Amino acid sequence: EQPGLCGLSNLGNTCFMNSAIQCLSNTPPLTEYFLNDKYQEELNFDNPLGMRGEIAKSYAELIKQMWSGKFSYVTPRAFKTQVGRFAPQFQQDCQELLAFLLDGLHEDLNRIRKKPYIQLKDADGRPDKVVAEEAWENHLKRNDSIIVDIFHGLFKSTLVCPECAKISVTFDPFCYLTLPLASKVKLKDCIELFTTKEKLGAEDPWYCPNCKEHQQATKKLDLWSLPPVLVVHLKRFSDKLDTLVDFPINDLDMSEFLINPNAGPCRYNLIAVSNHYGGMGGGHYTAFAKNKDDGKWYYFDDSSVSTASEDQIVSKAAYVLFYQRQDTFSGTGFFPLDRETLEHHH
Ligand SMILES: [Zn+2]
């Protein structure tokens, strides 16, 4: 058997979990962190928001199994049992589980011992660069982990009161982007739609702090900074949109969307896809992933692993896309673990 080419037993409508695990397992800087035992010293047992280290520990133990090269498949019973204990709601939505896991891993590994209270602020007519750099510093004072290092970006939100002209600007972290789907469209069409001005309705109004009243304000999102690993959730369920979204395998250039003039390169290659077949409350999840060792694509359908061709990856079954920024790849020294390993080996 080859490390990472390891299927996962279905334990009874757990294909949503197996699909999310194959995407994270095939996120190189995340797996490397766990295979190099960098997590033990960062486990945060006392965190009121975390899972007593139990999600990080069980996930670490499963990844070590999957990348040992001893197994054609493993049964992720202990991990499924810890997920169920801390998140009883877990056929599910693969994106909700991913959302739970990115937050749970983060809080289990969070380097901040005691979170300080931050007086949240509007731009107040200040320049974007200063408000963005403030937001990011504030985020890191409460949130500092391997999950932040890999997955967290920053978006700008602009709310416009139709009474009083109040322009409310905030910078907010994200660890994934949920895109609205526009028969066939391009991923870049979906990103453009994500960053388009939309009116809020009677459902979910915005409170104007000038007017002291709820308004149907216009909300525009813009991307300030994009993470090393960008997780792109295609909003199919919100019964299910079967729209064919065409996405690139290589050289997704995001630079046209980034409003930060001093940003570095933002070219991404695909590393995994969560697929979904059938309809909302049922159907079946699988995954495509690029193995970090051989650079080839494989298809993971619970316990089964098979070679895939790049020609099969782009289908309407594509639900969550994992992209990695080229400048962060293993061998660049971008990640501290990569840099330490390179410096050790040279
Ligand atoms: Zn107002």
Q: Any idea where the domains of the chain sit in the sequence? A: 7-345
How far is ligand 1, taken at its centre, from the CA of residue 260, in Å?
Answer: 28
How far is ligand 1, taken at its centre, from the CA of residue 313, in Å?
Answer: 47
Burial group, residue 313, by CB count within 10 angstroms (0-12, 13-18, 19+): buried
Cα–Cα separations (whole angstroms), residue 307 to 5, 242, 277, 317: 10, 25, 19, 18
CA triple 117-123-128, angle to 5 deg: 115
How far is ligand 1, taken at its centre, from the CA of residue 127, in Å?
Answer: 21
Q: Which residues surround ligand 1, an ion (CB under 5 A)?
A: 161, 163-164, 166, 208, 210-211
How far is ligand 1, taken at its centre, from the CA of residue 209, in Å?
Answer: 7
Burial group, residue 204, by CB count within 10 angstroms (0-12, 13-18, 19+): exposed
How far is ligand 1, taken at its centre, from the CA of residue 197, in Å?
Answer: 18
Contact assessment for residue 277 and residue 283, using Cβ atoms and an 8 Å cutoff: yes
Rounded (10°) CA dihedral 174, 327, 337, 73? 80
How far is ligand 1, taken at its centre, from the CA of residue 208, in Å?
Answer: 5
- What method did the depositors use to determine the structure? X-ray
Q: Which of 346, 237, 220 is nearest to 281 (CA)?
A: 237
Q: Which CATH number fits domain 7-345: 3.90.70.10, 2.40.10.10, 3.40.50.1970, 3.50.50.60?
A: 3.90.70.10
Cα–Cα separations (whole angstroms), residue 25 to 16, 30, 145, 189, 231: 14, 7, 18, 29, 14
Q: Which of 54, 112, 57 is nearest to 86 (CA)?
A: 54
Per the annotation, the verdict on 139 as an active-site residue is: no
* Residues contacting 271, CB < 8 A, separation 6+: 26, 27, 28, 229, 289, 290, 322, 323, 324
- Of the residues 152, 266, 284, 346, which is catalytic? 284
- Of the residues 15, 23, 94, 208, which is catalytic? 15
Tokens representing 68?
Answer: 């040992």
How far is ligand 1, taken at its centre, from the CA of residue 124, in Å?
Answer: 14
Residues 255-270 as b or e (16 or more Cβ within 10 Å = b)? eeebebeeeeebebeb
Contact assessment for residue 318 and residue 40, using Cβ atoms and an 8 Å cutoff: no
Location of structure tokens 């109004």: 205
How far is ligand 1, taken at its centre, from the CA of residue 129, in Å?
Answer: 25
Separation between Cα atoms, residue 217 and residue 304, nearest integer Å: 49
Separation between Cα atoms, residue 307 and residue 294, nearest integer Å: 12
Separation between Cα atoms, residue 219 and residue 197, nearest integer Å: 6
Q: Residue 229: CA atoms inside 13 Å, Cβ hemisphere, count?
A: 27
Residue 78: phi and psi, rounded to 5, are -60, -50
Tokens representing 315?
Answer: 């289908």
Per the annotation, the verdict on 276 as an active-site residue is: no
* Cross-strand pairs, 185: 245
Final resolution, Å: 2.0
How far is ligand 1, taken at its centre, from the CA of residue 300, in Å?
Answer: 51
Location of structure tokens 């990103």: 191
Which residue type sits at 327? D
How far is ligand 1, taken at its centre, from the CA of residue 215, in Å?
Answer: 7
Separation between Cα atoms, residue 297 and residue 287, nearest integer Å: 10
